[PDB]
Ligand binder design. Structure first.
Ligand SMILES: CNS(=O)(=O)CC1CCCCC1
Ligand SMILES: CNS(=O)(=O)CC1CCCCC1
Ligand SMILES: [Zn+2]
Ligand SMILES: [Zn+2]
Ligand SMILES: [Zn+2]
Length: 459
């Protein structure tokens, strides 16, 4: 069992206000037929338009919430809303577009999905809170058939053009008018009491209800992210590489080693309390310090309360030495800390919008991360950029312009002229550091941290 059987039952109660008289006994096979689509007994990679909760989770990057509200259904205008904030009015003749016929609305849908999804996913998963009008509108902008490849590349086809009779992926679909082989999931099938707003509002105060289709589309997708990534967490699911994942992760390890090594050299803490990932390894293995670990998985709902991580009776004395919180998100860091905190507000192909101000950071695994809160850092200050090295000044083995920088903390710089080796390493470090920052990571440190204390570690 990998795909959703078309013979699975579909609960129709949520559809009966838009579709009165709808049979209670209903399968996906009959529903797809009712929606105006014919599967023709085809074994060509597309067994069902609808997918399981598990298939949806693996394809979370493709999720686009979708809602259709009857503006006035054959004779009435429809308002199509998407979790991108777009509202389109389709006449059968928070962005709000005036009423237009389906032939032009479909081009806008294809353009919007393609620009939203080309750098995220090989597909689209329409996330529904199905009431009827959204399912019956699909025939006006969706075409289905065998799984196909793009006409200009090797990627799977996501769009079709009636002008050229050709197929394209999200990257080569300019001027295309049909969404081809989309996927969908009805959140109402999961078992809920009450309407969308009542279930959504139980976990989120950031998305309101301005009474438009896009608001419902946003709440639907938010509710789905809550159920799949906030209340339930699965770190066994791998996600494909779509960007700078490897460079970002490598940069994070480089910066962590640099910062902790320098804090230990500058302030000589006798003990380090490493709080976070239960699979953490000493980031400065050659350091003298008593290294003590404390297990905490990444918090996916609210930030950890420091009182619960530290109290209720370990070294016991977290006030001794320094505390290292490398992506261990707490409500208020103690004054003696070294912190890396992901900024959920960051715009990137890895960072998806999440629940209640949180974001869904997807890099190898999916991590729902609680909203970035500037007040968590009141006892600390921003960590300034610096490169420190005690390695020998020796080239070994790319061209050169002499490096002049006050933040290159090396013997050669102290001696008045940065060596080629330390200039190369400084520039590589600066690139890694800028990569980490741009990815959304933020660095904080105890207020007494001063890189002037590193110069005397060269005697
Ligand atoms: C120990 N967690 S991790 O470093 O694997 C991923 C983090 C990514 C950014 C948000 C917190 C979790
Ligand atoms: C050339 N300008 S500079 O500010 O980079 C001089 C360095 C001398 C050694 C300490 C760091 C600063
Ligand atoms: Zn293509
Ligand atoms: Zn929400
Ligand atoms: Zn040097």
């Amino acid at each position: 069992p990998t795909h959703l059987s078309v013979d699975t039952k579909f609960k129709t109660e949520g559809l009966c206000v838009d579709i009165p008289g709808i049979p209670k006994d209903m399968t996906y096979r009959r529903l797809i037929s009712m929606m105006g689509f014919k599967m023709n007994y085809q074994v060509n990679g597309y067994p069902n338009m609808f997918i399981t909760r598990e298939e949806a989770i693996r394809h979370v990057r493709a999720w686009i919430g979708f809602d259709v509200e009857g503006c006035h259904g054959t004779n009435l205008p429809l308002q199509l809303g998407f979790s991108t904030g777009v509202n389109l009015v389709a006449v059968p003749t928070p962005l709000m577009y005036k009423g237009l016929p389906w032939n032009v609305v479909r081009i806008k849908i294809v353009q919007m999905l393609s620009d939203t999804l080309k750098n995220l996913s090989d597909r689209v998963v329409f996330v529904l809170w199905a009431h009827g009008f959204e399912l019956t509108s699909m025939k006006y902008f969706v075409k289905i058939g065998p799984e196909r490849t793009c006409c200009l590349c090797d990627r799977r086809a996501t769009c079709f053009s009636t002008a050229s009779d050709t197929y394209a992926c999200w990257h080569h679909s300019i001027g295309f008018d049909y969404v081809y082989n989309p996927f969908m999931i009805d959140v109402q099938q999961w078992g809920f009491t009450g309407n969308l707003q009542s279930n959504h509002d139980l976990y989120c105060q950031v998305h309101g209800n301005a009474h438009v289709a896009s608001c419902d589309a946003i709440m639907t997708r938010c509710l789905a992210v809550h159920e799949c990534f906030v209340k339930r967490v699965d770190w066994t699911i791998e996600y494909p590489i779509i960007g700078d994942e490897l460079k970002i992760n490598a940069a994070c390890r480089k910066v962590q080693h640099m910062v902790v090594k320098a804090a230990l050299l500058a302030d000589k803490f006798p003990v380090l309390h490493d709080i976070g990932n239960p699979k953490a390894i000493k980031c400065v293995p050659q350091a003298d310090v008593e290294w003590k670990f404390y297990d905490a998985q990444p918090c996916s709902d609210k930030a950890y309360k420091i009182e619960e991580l530290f109290y209720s009776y370990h070294s016991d004395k977290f006030t001794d030495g320094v505390c290292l919180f490398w992506n261990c998100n707490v409500d208020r860091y103690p004054a003696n800390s070294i912190v890396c905190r992901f900024d959920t507000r960051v715009l990137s192909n890895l960072n998806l919008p999440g629940c209640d101000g949180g974001s869904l950071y997807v890099n190898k695994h999916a991590f729902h991360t609680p909203a970035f809160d500037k007040s968590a850092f009141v006892n600390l200050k921003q960590l300034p950029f610096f490169y420190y090295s005690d390695s020998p000044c020796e080239s070994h083995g790319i061209d050169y312009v002499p490096l002049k920088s006050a933040t290159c903390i090396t013997r050669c710089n102290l001696g008045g002229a940065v060596c080629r080796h330390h200039a190369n390493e400084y520039r590589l470090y600066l690139d890694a550091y800028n990569m980490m920052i741009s990815a959304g990571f933020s660095l904080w440190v105890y207020k007494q941290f001063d890189t002037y204390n590193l110069w005397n570690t060269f005697t």
